Structures are given as structure tokens and as C-alpha cells.
Amino acid sequence: AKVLCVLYDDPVDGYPKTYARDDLPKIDHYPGGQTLPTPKAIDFTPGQLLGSVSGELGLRKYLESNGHTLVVTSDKDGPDSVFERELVDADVVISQPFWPAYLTPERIAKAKNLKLALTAGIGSDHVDLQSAIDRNVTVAEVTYCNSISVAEHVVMMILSLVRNYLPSHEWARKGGWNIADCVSHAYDLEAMHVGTIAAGRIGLAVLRRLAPFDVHLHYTDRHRLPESVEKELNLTWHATREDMYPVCDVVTLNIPLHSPTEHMINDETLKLFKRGAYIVNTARGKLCDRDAVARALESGRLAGYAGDVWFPQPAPKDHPWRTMPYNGMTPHISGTTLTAQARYAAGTREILECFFEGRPIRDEYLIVQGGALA
Amino acid sequence: AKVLCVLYDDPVDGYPKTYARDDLPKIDHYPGGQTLPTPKAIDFTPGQLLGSVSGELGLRKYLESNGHTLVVTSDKDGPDSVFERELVDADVVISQPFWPAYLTPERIAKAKNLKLALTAGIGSDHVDLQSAIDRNVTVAEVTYCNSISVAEHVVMMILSLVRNYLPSHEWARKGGWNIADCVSHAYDLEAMHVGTIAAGRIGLAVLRRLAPFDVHLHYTDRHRLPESVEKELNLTWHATREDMYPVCDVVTLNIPLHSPTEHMINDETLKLFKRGAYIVNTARGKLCDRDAVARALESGRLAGYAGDVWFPQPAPKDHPWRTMPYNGMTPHISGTTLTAQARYAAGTREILECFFEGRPIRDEYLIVQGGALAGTGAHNY
Ligand SMILES: NC(=O)c1ccc[n+]([C@H]2O[C@@H](COP(=O)(O)OP(=O)(O)OC[C@@H]3O[C@H](n4ccc(N)nc4=O)[C@H](O)[C@@H]3O)[C@@H](O)[C@H]2O)c1
Ligand SMILES: NC(=O)c1ccc[n+]([C@H]2O[C@@H](COP(=O)(O)OP(=O)(O)OC[C@@H]3O[C@H](n4ccc(N)nc4=O)[C@H](O)[C@@H]3O)[C@@H](O)[C@H]2O)c1
């Protein structure tokens, strides 16, 4: 079979020959009991760069030694991409949400052999699910592989915005000192009201890490949490997002982007936020109207915004979120630490092994199978 | 009476006209039950810049309306400084560890009227305690006022080093994307081994904040914690510092600086750390030999270093920690957030009210009183 795998580019200084550390922490299962991926074997050392073209998700020897072909590229955009001209006879397509190969209806129609669309990561918003359903394409993902990774990124960004870390580091880096310039915008997180707009895998992991900071925890969600979970984390439940905003010092978005959530944060809904609120958004860029956020920071209504997701992605060189006041942005990376890569590269192999051997792919990995949602 | 107060400079654009928010979160007590400062009144709005010269810790109206003198300056260094010239007849001296007015024996000898030496913050190492004891000068500080503030700074810094935040944010600010360049040095914190070199007010609050990150917690200290605290946080105790380093992915320094602790992190003790360890040091700059750390980061021995404390301070413009690879430095600020200033300004006023009204200063505030090491001060020995 032919496996077409889209990964991001190597470092500009070349694929790393050495790494900062020798191994990764041992982890057995995710919160809730789902075990980490269980492939038959791996041909990589956990901790190597696996999500770039030269890393190949550690798949090449496994695939080729079983008679399959592996084509790896980073050129995925538009009809002229290597991805598209290679797609037409691909049996399996793999990409990561941080550098996604979109499977539009038109593209899936060109893909005459497509049997499996695998997300090396979490979240197949880049795949048209109806087209997969109609064409009996299996859609799978490495569930839970980077939920904790994002949750760490979120709490890191909350602390950094509230305490004014990034400007302070600039003062130290450029040779200054300037205590008052650092702290005239710096507060403690302790006892602030913090709310998350969803409490799924990421949101719940965020809430748990926030708890010993002695913040007041709020959340909303389409499905309310177990009362025992509300009890153990002292959660205040809000029926709607708009009920939650005005009482929160910090709001983190961990909700999916779909029709009722597009531009949910805009010029009108920002008027409901307390003066000096902070917003962290590792979910999707379009949850927030790009310029309303920038205006809110320029006018001093928000005291900070931080996240790793943008619209569009990759962000153009002039994207305003890069330079607006009190931003804590990174490129789209929170779910592709080396640690997370080791998990979903192992999960990618595990799923391929199952698919080729006819064994059932774990239920939790499945998004579409046998012509319907699964 | 005459109150002499040393504060740091106002911001470059002047004293702030507005702030990001209108108020501060309501807090009742510190961990352990000690209540927040309780002055009879405050002449400031919590959240204002109070630790700079124009902020005057919000003391002028209280002092002047009671017949007192308030002199506020930033010139603290040397015998011709404003501080030393005004010292000779000052009844009370106030300064912050962030810009501390040293009370050497010679200076305390010149301070003919000195009755109370107040630290607006935590850490009176700038006051010669023996000279204070001999001269029956009361030495006090606003205990616990910024312990949590520093603990937050630490976990923020641990996360930022481990996840490679600062380089990644640079890629975003400068117009790049460069995913592989961001994450070739980025890991998750989860399940790493993290240890603190002391488990006092900051060190224990750091431990509690790290727990739900599912790290494996280690610590050392001169006096171990209650076994019940060890149990509820799953702590691994180490009898010595040198035993703890080799098993930790992250080590945070939360120990005081004195002679047995000076340059405890050096070329020789760094050889005990795992390759790619991280160090966070919000404690004191001279806990680390400056160039040993700088060497350890060029060689990849450490994978990141971050803190807000330096030696000397203020750090000279060319200080290598400012620019060395994988550093997360800030200036010395973690304990002087606007939130922390509000508490220590209120505590300062509370102490002055006690001192002037003849009522006793809280025992937990006392370091030296009545000619002997006292209160919190006697507790540290
Ligand atoms: N590297 C990154 O930046 C990154 C990395 C990995 C993953 N992600 C993604 O993960 C998602 C949210 O995080 P998630 O935890 O993975 O999603 P999930 O576990 O399925 O559950 C949350 C749910 O919220 C729901 N819901 C739905 C609709 C609605 N109108 N109301 C709701 O409330 C429902 O209730 C449920 O609780 C994305 O937005 C994004 O963050 C981002
Ligand atoms: N803005 C800042 O940068 C900032 C702000 C506020 C405060 N600080 C300071 O905070 C201290 C950390 O201390 P502390 O956390 O404030 O509370 P503490 O009295 O000190 O407890 C720790 C103790 O450790 C002890 N010990 C002692 C000696 C020894 N040889 N072995 C020991 O083990 C003993 O056992 C005890 O438990 C300073 O270094 C510095 O960081 C920094």
C-alpha cells in the first residue's frame, strides 16, 4: 500500500543530530485510565524530532519492510502541492493538525485509493467527515496524545500574562533593569477568578493544575461535569458562556470551533469582560475575531492575550497578533512537544499496524469507520 | 518623628496614570493561617505602584498628618548618598529588598536616632542584626507578603523553560513560524522529577502548585516537613543537596544565601545534575557561580536556567545570564508585583501604627526587638 505522510519542515539549521536530554519521563496512562499507545514495536527513541519531514514519524522502516511505500513531504497547500499530485493513488494519508493536509470533498474525490485518513495528533477538522462517510474512508486520531501538553501550555501562558513575564524578560535580555517598568503591569494569579469555556480533556486538565494556585474556578460546557468533580475542584458552573465572562479575571478557551463558536469573542461580546481580563486561546484562532482582540488590547480593555492558534495558519508575516500590546503568542506548537510527538508517532504506528493486519483499531481512536461516525 | 524611605525608580514614561484593572482579589490569610496585614486604614487603592519613589508606599498623608517627616529617595549607595545624609537623625528606616538601603554597623552607628528598621518585603540581610541588637533598634519585615508571588514566578518559569516558551514567542514576534525550531527543545513537564532545595514558605507553595502537574516531587531542607505533608504531596526526602540533584529533571532553589550556601551551584556540583536538567532560582543570585551556570548552558549540561535574582545586583548590562542560551531571566521583580506591594505597603503602615501608638508589633513581623533576636528572627536562629 502507498502511505502519503505530510509533516512540517526540519529546523532551518537542519535536522538535529543531538538533543537536550537522553530520554522522556515514563508515563503509563492518561487521566481516566486510557493507556498510552501500544504498537507492536517502535523504530525511534522517544524524544527524537518525529513530526518534521526528516523524522517521518518513525515509520519508514516499518512500512517498507512490509512492502508499503512512504512518501513524505511538507508541500501540502493548493492543487499544485506535492501532496495533491501524490494523493490520487494514496491508500493512507497522514498529517498533523500543526501542519495539516486538508482532505476537502474535491480532494477526497481525486483520491481513488483512499482507505485511511490518519491524524497524527488530535482533531480532524482538516478532513471532510461526510465525504469520508460516503466513501467508506476510516478516519482515526491518536486520542489524548497531547491533551496534557496543551493544558501545560495554557497554565504557562496564564501565569506569564498575569505576571507580565514576556516584557520583563525583554528588559533583562536587552540589558535593562527597570523594576517599575516590569511590575506596573504585573499581578499575582492567586485568588483571581478563572474560567474555561469547555471542560473536556484539555479544560479539565487545566482546571486541576490551576486549583492549588487558589484561584476561583468557573466553567461552562454543553454537558455539565459530575457533581463529584465539581465538588473536588470547587467549580462554579455557568449555563452559558456569556454568563461566565463578566465574573472572570481570566478566561481560557478549550472549546471546539464550529458554527456557534466562530467569532464568539468579538467587539460586542468583549464588552462583557471585566476591565483588565486575560484571554488564553489554545483552541482555534477563529474563536476570536482577530481585530477585536487587537483593539481590546490597544485600548486597554484586555490586559493580555496569549495562545498558539491563529487565523489563518500559518500566520502571515504581518498578522496583528504578533505585535499587539501584551500578547504571549507562540506559533502552533503546544501539542507537538517532543514528548507529545513520541506518543502520537507510536499511536500512528499502532493504528497502521491494526489497519494493515485487519485487527480493530481502538474504539477511542476512531472518528469515522464503516460509513458512519464511530 | 522622621521616617526615611528608600524606593526604586518610577517607570521610564513616568508614574502611571492608569492601571490594567480596578482592584485586587480578596484574600483572607496566608497558607498556615497568618492573616494578611491589618492597618487601621490605608491611604491608597490596592493595585497602585507603591514601591517606586512616587508611590511612597502610600505613607505621606498618614505620617505628615500626624506630625511626622517623610523623606523618600532612591539614592541609597555610598556615604554621600541622600540616604546616608538623612540617616543621622531618622527615627525609622524603610526599604525593600528590591532596592535595599543597607544598615551597616558604621551606618547604624551614624544613625543617632534610629529606633525601627522596617523591611517593606521579606529579607533583612541588608540590616546588620548584631548592631541592631546592641543599639536596641527594632528590626521588622512584612512576613509572607510575597511568598506566593515568588512561588507563582517559579512554576511559570519551570513551565517556560521546559516547554521552550521564550524562543517560541520570539519566533512569533519576529514574523516566523518555524515549528520544528520551536519544538526541537520543547518537552512536557508531566512526570518529570522536580525538586526544591528548601521547603519553606516559597518552596512548599511551589511544591503544592507542582502537584497536579503529575511530576514526581523531591525536596531537601535543614528540617524535614511533617510526615503528613510528605504523605499528602508524595514527597521524596533527600538528606543532602548533592543527593537530590542527580535524580531531578528540574531543581528550584528556595534556600537563603549565607556562607554555607554561597556558590552551592558550581562547576563541581553541576557535574551531579542530569544532562539537560533545568534550574530555577528566585532565591539569591550568588547561590550560583555565575560562570559555572553560563558554562553549563553553552555545553548543554543544563537545558535551561531562569530566575529573577543576580550577582551583582542590579546586573551589569553585559551580565552573561541576560543572553546565554536557553535562559528565562527577568530583573529582580517576582516579589514586587502590584499585588505584593499592596500587602507590604499595608503591612508597613500597620507596623508604623503599632510603633507610634505604643501597641506591640505582631510577633511574626519581628526579627529583632528589645535587644535580642526576636519573633520570626529568633525562629530562623
Ligand atoms: N495544539 C493545540 O492548540 C491543540 C492541541 C490538541 C487539541 N486541540 C483541540 O482540542 C479541542 C478542545 O480541547 P479538547 O479537550 O481536546 O476537546 P474535547 O476533549 O473533545 O472536549 C471539549 C468539549 O467542549 C465541547 N463543546 C462543544 C461545542 C459547544 N458548543 N460547547 C461545548 O462545550 C464538549 O462539551 C466537550 O467538553 C480544540 O478546541 C482544540 O483545543 C488543540
Ligand atoms: N523576589 C525574590 O526573588 C524573593 C522574594 C522574597 C523572598 N525571597 C527569598 O525567599 C528566600 C527563600 O525563602 P522563603 O521561602 O522566603 O522562606 P523561608 O524562611 O526562607 O524557608 C526556607 C528555609 O530553608 C532553610 N534552610 C536554610 C539554610 C540552610 N543552610 N538550609 C536550609 O534548608 C530552612 O530550613 C527553611 O525551611 C530567599 O532565599 C529568597 O528566595 C526571594
Describe this entry's structure for a reader:
Chain B: The record marks 284, 332 as: Important for catalytic activity. Chain B: Homodimer. Chain B: It is an enzyme of class 1 (oxidoreductase). Chain B: InterPro entries: D-isomer_2_OHA_DH_cat_dom (IPR006139), D-isomer_DH_CS (IPR029753), D-isomer_DH_CS1 (IPR029752), D-isomer_DH_NAD-bd (IPR006140), FDH_NAD-dep (IPR033689), NAD(P)-bd_dom_sf (IPR036291). Chain B: Keywords: Cytoplasm, NAD, Oxidoreductase. The PDB classes it as oxidoreductase. Two copies of one chain form a homodimer. Chain A has twelve helices and 13 strands. A seven-stranded mixed β-sheet of chain A has the order 2-1-3-4-5-12-13. The first copy, chain A, has a six-stranded parallel β-sheet with strand order 8-7-6-9-10-11. Chain A has helices spanning 60-64, 82-87, 105-110, 129-134, 147-162, 165-173, 179-183, 201-210, 227-233, 241-244, 290-298, 338-357; strands at residues 2-6, 69-73, 92-95, 116-119, 138-141, 193-196, 216-219, 235-237, 250-253, 277-281, 302-307, 366-369, 372-373. In chain A, 28% of the residues lie in helices and 14% in strands. The two termini of chain A are 24 Å apart. The first copy, chain A, has two domains: 1-145 and 336-374, NAD(P)-binding Rossmann-like Domain (Rossmann fold), CATH 3.40.50.720; 146-335, NAD(P)-binding Rossmann-like Domain (Rossmann fold, 3-Layer(aba) Sandwich). In chain A, helix 5 crosses helix 8 (201-210). The first copy, chain A, is of the alpha/beta class and 374 residues long. Chain A is globular, with a radius of gyration of 22 Å. One ligand A7R is lined by residues 122-123, 146-147, 150, 198-203, 221-223, 254-256, 260-261, 282-284, 308-309, 334-335 of chain A.
